[PDB]
Design an enzyme around this catalytic site. Sequence first.
Site, PDB file in Angstrom:
ATOM      1  N   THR A  77       0.834  -1.235   0.000  1.00 19.25           N
ATOM      2  CA  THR A  77       0.000   0.000   0.000  1.00 19.25           C
ATOM      3  C   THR A  77       0.842   1.246   0.000  1.00 19.25           C
ATOM      4  OG1 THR A  77      -0.278   0.294   2.398  1.00 19.25           O
ATOM      5  CG2 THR A  77      -1.958  -1.094   1.191  1.00 19.25           C
ATOM      6  N   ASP A 121      -0.783  -4.776   3.312  1.00 18.19           N
ATOM      7  CA  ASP A 121       0.438  -4.367   4.000  1.00 18.19           C
ATOM      8  C   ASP A 121       0.491  -2.860   4.136  1.00 18.19           C
ATOM      9  OD1 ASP A 121       3.104  -5.374   5.118  1.00 18.19           O
ATOM     10  OD2 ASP A 121       3.685  -3.632   3.919  1.00 18.19           O
ATOM     11  N   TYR A 161       3.446   4.970   6.322  1.00 14.76           N
ATOM     12  CA  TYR A 161       2.867   5.190   5.019  1.00 14.76           C
ATOM     13  C   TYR A 161       1.839   6.294   5.020  1.00 14.76           C
ATOM     14  CZ  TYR A 161       4.838   0.516   4.238  1.00 14.76           C
ATOM     15  OH  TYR A 161       5.668  -0.556   4.201  1.00 14.76           O
ATOM     16  N   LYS A 221       2.864  -1.568  11.095  1.00 16.07           N
ATOM     17  CA  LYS A 221       4.261  -1.607  11.600  1.00 16.07           C
ATOM     18  C   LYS A 221       4.550  -0.425  12.529  1.00 16.07           C
ATOM     19  CE  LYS A 221       5.548  -3.345   6.933  1.00 16.07           C
ATOM     20  NZ  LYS A 221       4.650  -2.621   5.957  1.00 16.07           N
ATOM     21  N   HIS A 276       9.277  -2.119  12.124  1.00 19.94           N
ATOM     22  CA  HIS A 276       9.520  -1.759  10.732  1.00 19.94           C
ATOM     23  C   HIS A 276      10.946  -1.872  10.303  1.00 19.94           C
ATOM     24  CE1 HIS A 276       7.475   0.929   7.444  1.00 19.94           C
ATOM     25  NE2 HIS A 276       8.483   0.206   6.858  1.00 19.94           N
ATOM     26  N   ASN A 307      13.329  -5.859   8.014  1.00 19.63           N
ATOM     27  CA  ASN A 307      14.676  -5.318   7.777  1.00 19.63           C
ATOM     28  C   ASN A 307      15.683  -5.832   8.816  1.00 19.63           C
ATOM     29  OD1 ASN A 307      14.247  -3.695   5.412  1.00 19.63           O
ATOM     30  ND2 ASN A 307      12.782  -2.463   6.711  1.00 19.63           N
ATOM     31  N   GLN A 336      10.172  -9.451   7.357  1.00 23.66           N
ATOM     32  CA  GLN A 336       9.839  -8.784   6.111  1.00 23.66           C
ATOM     33  C   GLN A 336      11.039  -8.007   5.548  1.00 23.66           C
ATOM     34  OE1 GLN A 336       7.284  -5.133   4.485  1.00 23.66           O
ATOM     35  NE2 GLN A 336       5.951  -6.716   5.421  1.00 23.66           N
ATOM     36  N   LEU A 339       8.979  -6.793  -6.960  1.00 23.72           N
ATOM     37  CA  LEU A 339       8.930  -6.348  -8.353  1.00 23.72           C
ATOM     38  C   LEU A 339      10.048  -5.334  -8.730  1.00 23.72           C
ATOM     39  CD1 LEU A 339       4.964  -6.142  -8.747  1.00 23.72           C
ATOM     40  CD2 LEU A 339       6.535  -8.183  -9.194  1.00 23.72           C
ATOM     41  N   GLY A 340      11.009  -5.108  -7.838  1.00 23.91           N
ATOM     42  CA  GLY A 340      12.182  -4.268  -8.081  1.00 23.91           C
ATOM     43  C   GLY A 340      12.096  -2.898  -7.529  1.00 23.91           C
ATOM     44  N   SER A 341      11.087  -2.633  -6.655  1.00 26.12           N
ATOM     45  CA  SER A 341      10.922  -1.369  -5.947  1.00 26.12           C
ATOM     46  C   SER A 341      10.277  -0.323  -6.847  1.00 26.12           C
ATOM     47  CB  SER A 341      12.255  -0.834  -5.428  1.00 26.12           C
ATOM     48  OG  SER A 341      12.821   0.087  -6.388  1.00 26.12           O
ATOM     49  N   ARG A 371      -2.954  -3.678 -13.377  1.00 27.22           N
ATOM     50  CA  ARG A 371      -1.830  -4.388 -12.830  1.00 27.22           C
ATOM     51  C   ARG A 371      -2.201  -5.073 -11.508  1.00 27.22           C
ATOM     52  NH1 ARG A 371       0.701  -0.220 -15.744  1.00 27.22           N
ATOM     53  NH2 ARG A 371       0.963   1.198 -13.976  1.00 27.22           N
TER      54      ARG A 371
HETATM   55  N1  LIG Z   1       9.359  -3.203   5.322  1.00 29.67           N
HETATM   56  C1  LIG Z   1       9.900  -2.223   4.597  1.00 29.67           C
HETATM   57  O1  LIG Z   1      10.889  -1.573   4.889  1.00 29.67           O
HETATM   58  C2  LIG Z   1       9.309  -2.113   3.242  1.00 29.67           C
HETATM   59  C3  LIG Z   1      10.052  -1.576   2.228  1.00 29.67           C
HETATM   60  C4  LIG Z   1       9.469  -1.479   0.938  1.00 29.67           C
HETATM   61  C5  LIG Z   1       8.278  -2.031   0.651  1.00 29.67           C
HETATM   62  N2  LIG Z   1       7.511  -2.556   1.687  1.00 29.67           N
HETATM   63  C6  LIG Z   1       6.188  -3.090   1.396  1.00 29.67           C
HETATM   64  O2  LIG Z   1       6.248  -3.838   0.193  1.00 29.67           O
HETATM   65  C7  LIG Z   1       5.247  -3.242  -0.685  1.00 29.67           C
HETATM   66  C8  LIG Z   1       5.825  -3.444  -2.087  1.00 29.67           C
HETATM   67  O3  LIG Z   1       7.163  -3.191  -2.406  1.00 29.67           O
HETATM   68  P1  LIG Z   1       7.421  -1.811  -3.239  1.00 29.67           P
HETATM   69  O4  LIG Z   1       6.623  -0.714  -2.735  1.00 29.67           O
HETATM   70  O5  LIG Z   1       8.853  -1.556  -3.246  1.00 29.67           O
HETATM   71  O6  LIG Z   1       6.859  -2.155  -4.761  1.00 29.67           O
HETATM   72  P2  LIG Z   1       6.963  -3.435  -5.669  1.00 29.67           P
HETATM   73  O7  LIG Z   1       5.937  -4.466  -5.193  1.00 29.67           O
HETATM   74  O8  LIG Z   1       8.332  -3.869  -5.758  1.00 29.67           O
HETATM   75  O9  LIG Z   1       6.447  -2.768  -7.011  1.00 29.67           O
HETATM   76  C9  LIG Z   1       7.337  -1.928  -7.751  1.00 29.67           C
HETATM   77  C10 LIG Z   1       6.551  -1.241  -8.950  1.00 29.67           C
HETATM   78  O10 LIG Z   1       6.047  -2.425  -9.661  1.00 29.67           O
HETATM   79  C11 LIG Z   1       4.854  -1.955 -10.428  1.00 29.67           C
HETATM   80  N3  LIG Z   1       4.024  -3.072 -10.769  1.00 29.67           N
HETATM   81  C12 LIG Z   1       3.184  -3.760  -9.944  1.00 29.67           C
HETATM   82  N4  LIG Z   1       2.642  -4.817 -10.562  1.00 29.67           N
HETATM   83  C13 LIG Z   1       3.127  -4.775 -11.804  1.00 29.67           C
HETATM   84  C14 LIG Z   1       2.909  -5.569 -12.903  1.00 29.67           C
HETATM   85  N5  LIG Z   1       2.010  -6.522 -12.881  1.00 29.67           N
HETATM   86  N6  LIG Z   1       3.553  -5.281 -14.133  1.00 29.67           N
HETATM   87  C15 LIG Z   1       4.487  -4.176 -14.288  1.00 29.67           C
HETATM   88  N7  LIG Z   1       4.697  -3.450 -13.093  1.00 29.67           N
HETATM   89  C16 LIG Z   1       4.041  -3.729 -11.917  1.00 29.67           C
HETATM   90  C17 LIG Z   1       4.212  -0.906  -9.498  1.00 29.67           C
HETATM   91  O11 LIG Z   1       3.909   0.297 -10.261  1.00 29.67           O
HETATM   92  P3  LIG Z   1       2.334   0.722 -10.403  1.00 29.67           P
HETATM   93  O12 LIG Z   1       1.702   1.162  -9.139  1.00 29.67           O
HETATM   94  O13 LIG Z   1       2.327   1.669 -11.572  1.00 29.67           O
HETATM   95  O14 LIG Z   1       1.596  -0.521 -10.920  1.00 29.67           O
HETATM   96  C18 LIG Z   1       5.283  -0.635  -8.437  1.00 29.67           C
HETATM   97  O15 LIG Z   1       5.426   0.804  -8.209  1.00 29.67           O
HETATM   98  C19 LIG Z   1       5.248  -1.724  -0.289  1.00 29.67           C
HETATM   99  O16 LIG Z   1       4.100  -1.121  -0.944  1.00 29.67           O
HETATM  100  C20 LIG Z   1       5.104  -1.949   1.200  1.00 29.67           C
HETATM  101  O17 LIG Z   1       3.828  -2.455   1.590  1.00 29.67           O
HETATM  102  C21 LIG Z   1       8.061  -2.647   2.979  1.00 29.67           C
HETATM  103  O1  LIG Z   2       8.016   0.428   4.125  1.00 25.95           O
HETATM  104  C1  LIG Z   2       8.370   0.963   3.006  1.00 25.95           C
HETATM  105  O2  LIG Z   2       7.502   0.884   2.067  1.00 25.95           O
HETATM  106  C2  LIG Z   2       9.463   1.885   2.976  1.00 25.95           C
HETATM  107  C3  LIG Z   2       9.512   2.914   2.006  1.00 25.95           C
HETATM  108  C4  LIG Z   2      10.508   3.915   2.057  1.00 25.95           C
HETATM  109  C5  LIG Z   2      11.458   3.880   3.089  1.00 25.95           C
HETATM  110  C6  LIG Z   2      11.423   2.860   4.054  1.00 25.95           C
HETATM  111  S1  LIG Z   2      12.488   2.868   5.323  1.00 25.95           S
HETATM  112  O3  LIG Z   2      12.965   4.213   5.523  1.00 25.95           O
HETATM  113  O4  LIG Z   2      11.965   2.004   6.364  1.00 25.95           O
HETATM  114  N1  LIG Z   2      13.868   2.107   4.939  1.00 25.95           N
HETATM  115  C7  LIG Z   2      13.700   0.711   4.443  1.00 25.95           C
HETATM  116  C8  LIG Z   2      14.968  -0.037   4.765  1.00 25.95           C
HETATM  117  C9  LIG Z   2      16.121   0.602   4.200  1.00 25.95           C
HETATM  118  C10 LIG Z   2      17.318  -0.124   4.074  1.00 25.95           C
HETATM  119  C11 LIG Z   2      18.441   0.437   3.507  1.00 25.95           C
HETATM  120  C12 LIG Z   2      18.369   1.758   3.091  1.00 25.95           C
HETATM  121  C13 LIG Z   2      17.210   2.475   3.229  1.00 25.95           C
HETATM  122  C14 LIG Z   2      16.056   1.922   3.814  1.00 25.95           C
HETATM  123  C15 LIG Z   2      14.835   2.717   3.960  1.00 25.95           C
HETATM  124  C16 LIG Z   2      10.424   1.910   3.993  1.00 25.95           C
END
Ligand SMILES: NC(=O)c1ccc[n+]([C@@H]2O[C@H](COP(=O)([O-])OP(=O)(O)OC[C@H]3O[C@@H](n4cnc5c(N)ncnc54)[C@H](OP(=O)(O)O)[C@@H]3O)[C@@H](O)[C@H]2O)c1
Ligand SMILES: O=C(O)c1cccc(S(=O)(=O)N2CCc3ccccc3C2)c1
Length: 315
Positions: free
Chosen positions: A18, A45, A50, A79, A112, A162, A185, A214-216, A271
Amino acid sequence: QCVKLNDGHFMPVLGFGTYAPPEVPRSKALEVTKLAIEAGFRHIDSAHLYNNEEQVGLAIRSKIADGSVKREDIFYTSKLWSTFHRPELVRPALENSLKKAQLDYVDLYLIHSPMSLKPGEELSPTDENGKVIFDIVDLCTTWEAMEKCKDAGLAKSIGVSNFNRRQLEMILNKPGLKYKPVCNQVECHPYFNRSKLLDFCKSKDIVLVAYSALGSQRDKRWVDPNSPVLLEDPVLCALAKKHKRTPALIALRYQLQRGVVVLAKSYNEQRIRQNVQVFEFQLTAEDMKAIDGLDRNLHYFNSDSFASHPNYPYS
Ligand SMILES: NC(=O)c1ccc[n+]([C@@H]2O[C@H](COP(=O)([O-])OP(=O)(O)OC[C@H]3O[C@@H](n4cnc5c(N)ncnc54)[C@H](OP(=O)(O)O)[C@@H]3O)[C@@H](O)[C@H]2O)c1
Ligand SMILES: O=C(O)c1cccc(S(=O)(=O)N2CCc3ccccc3C2)c1
């Protein structure tokens, strides 16, 4: 389509991400979260960070009110943000997350990040110069406060995010541990597949949940835009063409076939619906080996500030 956690609860294996950057209007989280539920997502999530818990919570509520799902069919994660690690701050932070989402409980509450930040009202406290200000907290005490949140029923399950192997071991070996984390996570995709941490998590009955699968989102605040685009990889693209799928679906299926719970963020209605097709096909043992070979120790997330944090997880 769920996995049993080490506390007896069940986590759907595909989750909806989200997070959207600050520039996105808040009403979008509400729209897309409904769309995700409508498509078939059952794991959602979110996080304090967020700034969308109201809108995600409202989407959940809307799909309950309209008859499509029951509360107990949705797995909702939030989180604890890194300004709230000090133990006395943890339950109130959870209670505030609950108030915003208007839920009685979260299915999962995570720490987180291990990179504690100075407590206060700012998400990212910075000093005189531009520098993010760190704190020091024994995360074993943060964990004890998390345990108390499960015991009060405010979170059904508790986990971390992390964490590296050393940081997981710290909790696993805490004297007096009551509940193991149910999950860790972490960033995980074919350019950073985490096989060794995955094996470690499996050895301890801890689920690895993949973010940036999906590569961020490649936001230049965290990710170098000249890094390679995961979904343009030639191997993922050849697999997509072979299976009549897309590179994203190949990336998500990969994780499911290795025992990883995978998140997928999309704010695009088509998507979002495409991503639930992950359940529709299977990769061969040879497909999996080919994807395994893409690993290249690449974390998209990068920060000179965080790299100096004593609890930085990447070394
Ligand atoms: N714990 C943490 O520190 C942390 C860190 C990062 C992420 N997260 C969680 O993980 C979730 C996802 O990871 P993320 O935000 O980095 O994104 P991701 O899932 O890696 O997606 C990256 C990009 O992929 C695109 N996409 C999605 N489905 C697609 C498809 N079917 N075909 C082509 N492109 C596609 C989306 O763009 P569009 O919106 O245009 O489709 C998205 O912006 C976050 O939203 C959050 O809930 C947690
Ligand atoms: O939860 C996420 O979607 C998210 C998005 C942006 C930033 C972060 S963060 O500040 O929690 N953090 C993720 C872990 C990390 C590890 C290495 C370098 C930067 C960050 C940022 C998390």
